[PDB]
Amino acid sequence: MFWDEVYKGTPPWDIDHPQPAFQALIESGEIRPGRALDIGCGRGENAIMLAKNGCDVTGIDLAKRAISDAKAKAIERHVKVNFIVGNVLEMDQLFTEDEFDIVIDSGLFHVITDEERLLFTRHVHKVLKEGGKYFMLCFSDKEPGEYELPRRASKAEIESTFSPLFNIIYIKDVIFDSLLNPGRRQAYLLSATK
Template sequence: MNENAGRNIRTVDDVLSLLDGLFAPEADRWTAGAASWWDGFYADRSKPVPFFVAKPDENLVSYLDRGLITPGRALDLGCGPGRNALRLASLGFEVDAVDLSPAAIAWAEDRAREAGAGVRFHCGDAFTLTASELSGPYDLIYDSGCFHHLPPHRRISYLGLLDRVLAPGGHLALTCFAAGEIGSELPDADFYRQSGLQGGLAYTPESLRWIFSDLAEVELRRMRDEPPESPLFGEPFLWTALFRSPRCTA
């Protein structure tokens, strides 16, 4: 008989894993076990999904055009078919791009070959990839739609990742669901009572500022609505945020 049966909590990682298990597989869309869900999502490349288009986010292009971010080392979290990773690589960034879904990574690699872009793609959970796989520190961490699919307790892992791999003075840029437009506005505790994320969490500007309060806010605004003929992706139901890490003073 296992003397420890039923007594599995010893570390913070054990607590996080326990909380992961409270979510139904179809709702828990960020862990490695959910790769098959995302594979199904990306299986049909012709689906009319807004972000399947081979266009970079309008806010990312705006940051670059205004010199708010400049070429360096970049990490694209939840890269999907690679549309933002490819734009960064085309402008001289050294890019690592991560996604849980093998189907998404395969699509992104196809696009990279067609474009002749040198992006390093990694299939897996960014929170558990090793230092040899994520060759940080990164001057830019870009997240277009990953953060709002995390269960609340995994914000701890997200902030821990920033602490480990975001360079001093580097930037975090993200897009996420805007409260009042799309996504669930339930309090954090209710997601555990219902064992599901209801398609993703909606955020307010105040909640984003509080979560990322260790970083300096550069810009936080609604994403601009881009028409179908635009070379850029833009949907107004998303927030766009750019934060900067403090520089070392030592």
């Protein structure tokens, strides 16, 4: 399918290190040891980073190629991570309620379609523990109107999407590392709690 196609090679988000915004959450004390889920984990850089910093990590992604490459990376780097092929819009059949202390989202929200957004928020909300944290990284949208392609998320769009089920702690300007020529893209980091 679609996501197997993009992993026939190295897509622009598929950097060889964890995203700096998530590394900084470790440095700032915001990500503390617990059970963590990386939704749309790709080839596993952020998930492995969380695992090397005291978390029990599960990563879920639609693309078997990404999951297979993520697993091999964890094996190479002597780290234990639970990498599984799966659909975040169906993960109620994979995880029970109130399971994860942390959910990280590095570019998944960015690709979730409008008609799947409410369902997406509900599934993320369901698998998080009481008091659980959701950290989401996306490209920032500060331009009036919605002509920009690919989509980018404004603070209003983020607030409108995640306020119904989450308490928003902050939406911070950050950088998103990319393989494309402006290798640093303006981005938002949402910190939210269940």
